[PDB]
Amino acid sequence: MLDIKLIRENPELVKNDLIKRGELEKVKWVDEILKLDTEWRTKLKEINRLRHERNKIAVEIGKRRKKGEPVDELLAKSREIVKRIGELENEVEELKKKIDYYLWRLPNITHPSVPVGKDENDNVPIRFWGKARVWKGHLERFLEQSQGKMEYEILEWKPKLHVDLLEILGGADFARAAKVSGSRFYYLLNEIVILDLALIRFALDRLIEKGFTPVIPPYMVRRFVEEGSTSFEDFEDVIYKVEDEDLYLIPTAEHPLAGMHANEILDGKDLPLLYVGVSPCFRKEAGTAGKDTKGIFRVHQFHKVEQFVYSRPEESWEWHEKIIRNAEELFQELEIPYRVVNICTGDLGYVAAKKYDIEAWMPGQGKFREVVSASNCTDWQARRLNIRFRDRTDEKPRYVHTLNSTAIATSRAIVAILENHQEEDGTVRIPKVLWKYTGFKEIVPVE
Amino acid sequence: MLDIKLIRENPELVKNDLIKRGELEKVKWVDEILKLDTEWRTKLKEINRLRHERNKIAVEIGKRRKKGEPVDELLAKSREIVKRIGELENEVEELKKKIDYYLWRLPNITHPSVPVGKDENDNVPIRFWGKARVWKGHLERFLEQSQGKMEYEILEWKPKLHVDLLEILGGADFARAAKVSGSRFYYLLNEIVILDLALIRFALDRLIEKGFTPVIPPYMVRRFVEEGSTSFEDFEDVIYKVEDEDLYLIPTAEHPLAGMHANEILDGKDLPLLYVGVSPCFRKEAGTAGKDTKGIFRVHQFHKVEQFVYSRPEESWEWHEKIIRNAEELFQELEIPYRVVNICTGDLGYVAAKKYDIEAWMPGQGKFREVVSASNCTDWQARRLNIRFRDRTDEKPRYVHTLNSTAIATSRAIVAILENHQEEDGTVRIPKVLWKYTGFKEIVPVE
Ligand SMILES: Nc1ncnc2c1ncn2[C@@H]1O[C@H](COS(=O)(=O)NC(=O)[C@@H](N)CO)[C@@H](O)[C@H]1O
Ligand SMILES: Nc1ncnc2c1ncn2[C@@H]1O[C@H](COS(=O)(=O)NC(=O)[C@@H](N)CO)[C@@H](O)[C@H]1O
């Protein structure tokens, strides 16, 4: 939700951002909310004018009670003021309603640092890490995507896709999942199940060492926490609703983590509130149904360890910068080469002001693929969920800033590990850092 | 689902089991489906009679093509025949639907060893284990439910309820969960989060050592798998359905685990199939809303590690006995005193032929509470999901038997650990076997 103040004190700023975002069909809204806001304040001034008249007509009726007192008329004028006052009041409500409708449907204003672009092809790489294992046949793509700024080793044999590796490793059963639930669902098996849990504990442990309170949130939440966390389009594209209830399956622990303090005035001495949640995630992935990667890259359910932050507006950008580094550390320990990107205006999304993604190099796919997202949400969620804070019981509570970032979404971490640590025969070596969690050091093909 | 051959050859057997179960209402169905199945079988006979007649009547109508051919009378019967075959066919389909309606709503035949009883009270304790810590004010109920066959020790201080311990330890937030999702939902925090995951890993490692294949199933399944795993009653009372979708939230890994091999003829050589699934579980818990325990004992969402077994009918009873002991073993290492009960016909449920429950002694509650349940479903689920096996590609495939049993449902294992291992000052010592998983040796109060 946008602050009405901001559109009043700089409509051109919001219109131009809408254009940098590709939300042109919504530029015409800035003026609409303005003329509505204007009408809103005009009627209110009218109401006070009337409240004042009510007072005058009052002292006047009584002033006659001592005199001739032909009041009758004054009493009828009095009757019209209340009649009128009520109307204006109800007219002012409807007006606030139309104004907020737009306010809730406008994306967060982007930060000056986010590059301008049309889509994912305009995202800007800003950092690279690791030594990529590239197939001779992906060399140009790799080089263009890495901008020659990343170390790499050329591979003789052709590296396999994660889906095929799950098969040779006996780690999944897709066909029986399709029979039981439909496409893009799966049964995960054997060592891959241990690997999934291991990834959760590892992520969990590290964020805990950095001071994050671990949490297992509700997996089903009430509609308001969903509309308080993202744009309404998500109800059609990503979010599942459960029949006959005000319950929605969460698409990320982020949402229940943000609703956690809905309608609170936090005590500033506590900020920043640091949460690291674990939870399964459910998404419709409606926009797609059969794009390309056929295993566990883009499915209906996956596990994710999530970082969530409540900070002072003056501390958020610094936090943003820390959470993305927190995710970067995990993948470095997991020995996964990657590049982090600054997402452009057109591929940014409604909630964030600025967003960084970690796209891991996927030897088999021959490309960098999103594996984590870190967003600084400014006060966009706070203004919706009414999450404020006060430093002195004195007064004036202000909205907090919220941030979120993937620590590890196991689904894609597993693909990154299978594709990046595979050997010619299919054997997949597991990063030393996880040995304490898994037991085994590698996963060998079955026969 | 019950086998119709079974109700045709031994109707007394099934109505007697229905009366044992105290299902006087549906004892009537046996006669009903018998009469419906008779009509069905007969009309079916009629169909072939007429069909063969139609041919023999069309061969003699042409034999008249070479003769006088006063076939007008014949041409008329040939038309009466098809019109007859047509209505019979529809009568048949209608008949099949009515009998199936019943066949699918009929409980499994109980094993003679299942005690007759009306509700939980008539469940029979057959084994006890451990040394209970009993508050003096609970002495009577403890001896009542322990039969005085269990070692114990009287506490002069009143041990607390898990809900209060969760508060003092700082391991949960219920108020905020109610805000965001509704009642009987929660946020788990700090060490409780780690303990939860540690219990899942502990249960998995143990079942894996015993040769169970670890699996993470789909958490949402199509209606047919649910209808294949329980009684239809469960759609109203327990299972959440997702809007505009043939998807249902699973109440236990047992369901997708059973759905996994729906419509297959397994190779007997592969029997038994041993699976240990992990997954969150969702239940409506409609018959309640406010009963008694108000923490994480009866909630809408919990984690459970499930044991599932596909076996030859000749091995199912020995496996029933092995999986309950698998669960007992976990609870003994967890140092939780308990008793196990053979469930009476009244509290049995529709899919089990026999069931054992492990009831953990709960110091704070002052009573034994169900913590795990284990069943032998015989061929009830197998007949519904069409799961058969065959040793030689030559033989008629026959139905397998299925079994399921809790390994550890983390919610109740956690209340058991909190209540049995609390000290007077509020700290809880976590059992040794879990140290390798939790890291910490106990959980001390916060202030
Ligand atoms: N449909 C999906 N299937 C598998 N993994 C997914 C899916 N959607 C997202 N993910 C994983 O989860 C990560 C985070 O999801 S995200 O929508 O980009 N961002 C969020 O959810 C934020 N709350 C930050 O985690 C993705 O980068 C990816 O690693
Ligand atoms: N609503 C609930 N809230 C919390 N824990 C629950 C709930 N329902 C069941 N459990 C836990 O899960 C266990 C198994 O549930 S059960 O219905 O008895 N049996 C099953 O689900 C079988 N698949 C065996 O696990 C219970 O013993 C209890 O420990």
JSON list of C-alpha atoms in Angstrom, two decimals, chain A residues 190-288:
[
{"chain": "A", "resi": 190, "resn": "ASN", "atom": "CA", "xyz": [16.06, -42.20, -0.04]},
{"chain": "A", "resi": 191, "resn": "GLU", "atom": "CA", "xyz": [19.14, -40.08, 0.39]},
{"chain": "A", "resi": 192, "resn": "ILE", "atom": "CA", "xyz": [17.41, -37.16, -1.29]},
{"chain": "A", "resi": 193, "resn": "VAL", "atom": "CA", "xyz": [14.97, -37.06, 1.65]},
{"chain": "A", "resi": 194, "resn": "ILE", "atom": "CA", "xyz": [17.90, -36.91, 4.06]},
{"chain": "A", "resi": 195, "resn": "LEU", "atom": "CA", "xyz": [19.53, -34.25, 1.89]},
{"chain": "A", "resi": 196, "resn": "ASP", "atom": "CA", "xyz": [16.36, -32.13, 1.97]},
{"chain": "A", "resi": 197, "resn": "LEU", "atom": "CA", "xyz": [16.14, -32.25, 5.77]},
{"chain": "A", "resi": 198, "resn": "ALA", "atom": "CA", "xyz": [19.89, -31.69, 6.05]},
{"chain": "A", "resi": 199, "resn": "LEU", "atom": "CA", "xyz": [19.64, -28.50, 3.99]},
{"chain": "A", "resi": 200, "resn": "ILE", "atom": "CA", "xyz": [16.91, -27.18, 6.33]},
{"chain": "A", "resi": 201, "resn": "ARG", "atom": "CA", "xyz": [19.00, -27.83, 9.49]},
{"chain": "A", "resi": 202, "resn": "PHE", "atom": "CA", "xyz": [22.14, -26.33, 7.95]},
{"chain": "A", "resi": 203, "resn": "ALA", "atom": "CA", "xyz": [20.33, -23.13, 6.90]},
{"chain": "A", "resi": 204, "resn": "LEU", "atom": "CA", "xyz": [18.52, -23.08, 10.21]},
{"chain": "A", "resi": 205, "resn": "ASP", "atom": "CA", "xyz": [21.73, -23.46, 12.22]},
{"chain": "A", "resi": 206, "resn": "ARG", "atom": "CA", "xyz": [23.65, -20.73, 10.50]},
{"chain": "A", "resi": 207, "resn": "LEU", "atom": "CA", "xyz": [20.91, -18.09, 10.74]},
{"chain": "A", "resi": 208, "resn": "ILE", "atom": "CA", "xyz": [20.50, -19.03, 14.39]},
{"chain": "A", "resi": 209, "resn": "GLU", "atom": "CA", "xyz": [24.20, -18.42, 15.01]},
{"chain": "A", "resi": 210, "resn": "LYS", "atom": "CA", "xyz": [23.71, -14.96, 13.43]},
{"chain": "A", "resi": 211, "resn": "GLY", "atom": "CA", "xyz": [20.98, -14.15, 15.94]},
{"chain": "A", "resi": 212, "resn": "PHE", "atom": "CA", "xyz": [17.72, -15.18, 14.24]},
{"chain": "A", "resi": 213, "resn": "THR", "atom": "CA", "xyz": [14.94, -16.69, 16.37]},
{"chain": "A", "resi": 214, "resn": "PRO", "atom": "CA", "xyz": [13.80, -19.87, 14.63]},
{"chain": "A", "resi": 215, "resn": "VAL", "atom": "CA", "xyz": [10.14, -20.38, 13.93]},
{"chain": "A", "resi": 216, "resn": "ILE", "atom": "CA", "xyz": [7.69, -22.92, 12.53]},
{"chain": "A", "resi": 217, "resn": "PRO", "atom": "CA", "xyz": [4.65, -20.80, 11.52]},
{"chain": "A", "resi": 218, "resn": "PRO", "atom": "CA", "xyz": [1.07, -21.79, 10.69]},
{"chain": "A", "resi": 219, "resn": "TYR", "atom": "CA", "xyz": [1.00, -23.25, 7.15]},
{"chain": "A", "resi": 220, "resn": "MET", "atom": "CA", "xyz": [-2.54, -21.99, 6.58]},
{"chain": "A", "resi": 221, "resn": "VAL", "atom": "CA", "xyz": [-3.40, -18.37, 7.24]},
{"chain": "A", "resi": 222, "resn": "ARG", "atom": "CA", "xyz": [-6.37, -15.99, 7.07]},
{"chain": "A", "resi": 223, "resn": "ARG", "atom": "CA", "xyz": [-6.97, -13.96, 3.88]},
{"chain": "A", "resi": 224, "resn": "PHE", "atom": "CA", "xyz": [-5.89, -10.64, 5.42]},
{"chain": "A", "resi": 225, "resn": "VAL", "atom": "CA", "xyz": [-2.35, -11.81, 6.08]},
{"chain": "A", "resi": 226, "resn": "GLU", "atom": "CA", "xyz": [-2.13, -12.82, 2.40]},
{"chain": "A", "resi": 227, "resn": "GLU", "atom": "CA", "xyz": [-3.44, -9.53, 1.12]},
{"chain": "A", "resi": 228, "resn": "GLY", "atom": "CA", "xyz": [-1.22, -7.84, 3.65]},
{"chain": "A", "resi": 229, "resn": "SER", "atom": "CA", "xyz": [1.83, -9.57, 2.18]},
{"chain": "A", "resi": 230, "resn": "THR", "atom": "CA", "xyz": [1.58, -9.40, -1.64]},
{"chain": "A", "resi": 231, "resn": "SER", "atom": "CA", "xyz": [-0.41, -8.09, -4.55]},
{"chain": "A", "resi": 232, "resn": "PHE", "atom": "CA", "xyz": [-3.92, -9.33, -5.16]},
{"chain": "A", "resi": 233, "resn": "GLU", "atom": "CA", "xyz": [-2.89, -10.93, -8.47]},
{"chain": "A", "resi": 234, "resn": "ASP", "atom": "CA", "xyz": [-1.22, -13.65, -6.39]},
{"chain": "A", "resi": 235, "resn": "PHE", "atom": "CA", "xyz": [-4.65, -15.03, -5.34]},
{"chain": "A", "resi": 236, "resn": "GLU", "atom": "CA", "xyz": [-5.20, -16.01, -8.94]},
{"chain": "A", "resi": 237, "resn": "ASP", "atom": "CA", "xyz": [-1.68, -17.14, -9.83]},
{"chain": "A", "resi": 238, "resn": "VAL", "atom": "CA", "xyz": [0.06, -18.49, -6.79]},
{"chain": "A", "resi": 239, "resn": "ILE", "atom": "CA", "xyz": [-2.19, -18.93, -3.77]},
{"chain": "A", "resi": 240, "resn": "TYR", "atom": "CA", "xyz": [-4.42, -21.91, -2.99]},
{"chain": "A", "resi": 241, "resn": "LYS", "atom": "CA", "xyz": [-7.52, -21.29, -0.91]},
{"chain": "A", "resi": 242, "resn": "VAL", "atom": "CA", "xyz": [-9.10, -24.07, 1.15]},
{"chain": "A", "resi": 243, "resn": "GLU", "atom": "CA", "xyz": [-12.81, -24.68, 0.63]},
{"chain": "A", "resi": 244, "resn": "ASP", "atom": "CA", "xyz": [-15.39, -23.16, 3.01]},
{"chain": "A", "resi": 245, "resn": "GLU", "atom": "CA", "xyz": [-12.85, -21.45, 5.29]},
{"chain": "A", "resi": 246, "resn": "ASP", "atom": "CA", "xyz": [-10.94, -18.23, 5.63]},
{"chain": "A", "resi": 247, "resn": "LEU", "atom": "CA", "xyz": [-7.70, -20.23, 5.20]},
{"chain": "A", "resi": 248, "resn": "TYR", "atom": "CA", "xyz": [-4.99, -20.01, 2.54]},
{"chain": "A", "resi": 249, "resn": "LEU", "atom": "CA", "xyz": [-1.95, -22.27, 2.10]},
{"chain": "A", "resi": 250, "resn": "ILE", "atom": "CA", "xyz": [1.15, -20.17, 2.51]},
{"chain": "A", "resi": 251, "resn": "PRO", "atom": "CA", "xyz": [3.44, -19.74, -0.54]},
{"chain": "A", "resi": 252, "resn": "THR", "atom": "CA", "xyz": [6.37, -18.90, 1.73]},
{"chain": "A", "resi": 253, "resn": "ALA", "atom": "CA", "xyz": [6.96, -18.58, 5.48]},
{"chain": "A", "resi": 254, "resn": "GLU", "atom": "CA", "xyz": [7.44, -14.90, 4.66]},
{"chain": "A", "resi": 255, "resn": "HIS", "atom": "CA", "xyz": [3.65, -14.26, 4.75]},
{"chain": "A", "resi": 256, "resn": "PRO", "atom": "CA", "xyz": [2.83, -15.81, 8.17]},
{"chain": "A", "resi": 257, "resn": "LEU", "atom": "CA", "xyz": [6.06, -14.26, 9.48]},
{"chain": "A", "resi": 258, "resn": "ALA", "atom": "CA", "xyz": [4.79, -10.81, 8.45]},
{"chain": "A", "resi": 259, "resn": "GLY", "atom": "CA", "xyz": [1.26, -11.31, 9.71]},
{"chain": "A", "resi": 260, "resn": "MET", "atom": "CA", "xyz": [2.79, -12.41, 13.03]},
{"chain": "A", "resi": 261, "resn": "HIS", "atom": "CA", "xyz": [2.88, -8.81, 14.30]},
{"chain": "A", "resi": 262, "resn": "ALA", "atom": "CA", "xyz": [-0.09, -7.41, 12.36]},
{"chain": "A", "resi": 263, "resn": "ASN", "atom": "CA", "xyz": [-1.79, -4.58, 14.30]},
{"chain": "A", "resi": 264, "resn": "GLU", "atom": "CA", "xyz": [1.02, -3.95, 16.78]},
{"chain": "A", "resi": 265, "resn": "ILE", "atom": "CA", "xyz": [2.99, -0.95, 17.83]},
{"chain": "A", "resi": 266, "resn": "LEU", "atom": "CA", "xyz": [6.37, -2.46, 18.47]},
{"chain": "A", "resi": 267, "resn": "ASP", "atom": "CA", "xyz": [8.74, -1.16, 21.12]},
{"chain": "A", "resi": 268, "resn": "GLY", "atom": "CA", "xyz": [11.71, 0.29, 19.24]},
{"chain": "A", "resi": 269, "resn": "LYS", "atom": "CA", "xyz": [14.15, -1.06, 21.79]},
{"chain": "A", "resi": 270, "resn": "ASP", "atom": "CA", "xyz": [13.54, -4.53, 20.31]},
{"chain": "A", "resi": 271, "resn": "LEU", "atom": "CA", "xyz": [14.07, -3.74, 16.62]},
{"chain": "A", "resi": 272, "resn": "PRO", "atom": "CA", "xyz": [15.38, -5.37, 14.61]},
{"chain": "A", "resi": 273, "resn": "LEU", "atom": "CA", "xyz": [13.15, -8.43, 15.10]},
{"chain": "A", "resi": 274, "resn": "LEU", "atom": "CA", "xyz": [14.97, -11.27, 13.38]},
{"chain": "A", "resi": 275, "resn": "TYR", "atom": "CA", "xyz": [13.12, -14.36, 12.27]},
{"chain": "A", "resi": 276, "resn": "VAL", "atom": "CA", "xyz": [14.21, -17.46, 10.43]},
{"chain": "A", "resi": 277, "resn": "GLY", "atom": "CA", "xyz": [11.26, -19.68, 9.58]},
{"chain": "A", "resi": 278, "resn": "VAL", "atom": "CA", "xyz": [11.00, -23.18, 8.11]},
{"chain": "A", "resi": 279, "resn": "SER", "atom": "CA", "xyz": [7.88, -24.33, 6.34]},
{"chain": "A", "resi": 280, "resn": "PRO", "atom": "CA", "xyz": [6.59, -26.18, 3.36]},
{"chain": "A", "resi": 281, "resn": "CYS", "atom": "CA", "xyz": [5.41, -23.82, 0.58]},
{"chain": "A", "resi": 282, "resn": "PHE", "atom": "CA", "xyz": [2.48, -24.18, -1.77]},
{"chain": "A", "resi": 283, "resn": "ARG", "atom": "CA", "xyz": [2.05, -22.38, -5.06]},
{"chain": "A", "resi": 284, "resn": "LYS", "atom": "CA", "xyz": [-0.34, -22.84, -7.95]},
{"chain": "A", "resi": 285, "resn": "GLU", "atom": "CA", "xyz": [2.25, -21.78, -10.52]},
{"chain": "A", "resi": 286, "resn": "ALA", "atom": "CA", "xyz": [-0.80, -21.05, -12.67]},
{"chain": "A", "resi": 287, "resn": "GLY", "atom": "CA", "xyz": [0.97, -18.92, -15.27]},
{"chain": "A", "resi": 288, "resn": "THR", "atom": "CA", "xyz": [2.81, -22.11, -16.25]}
]
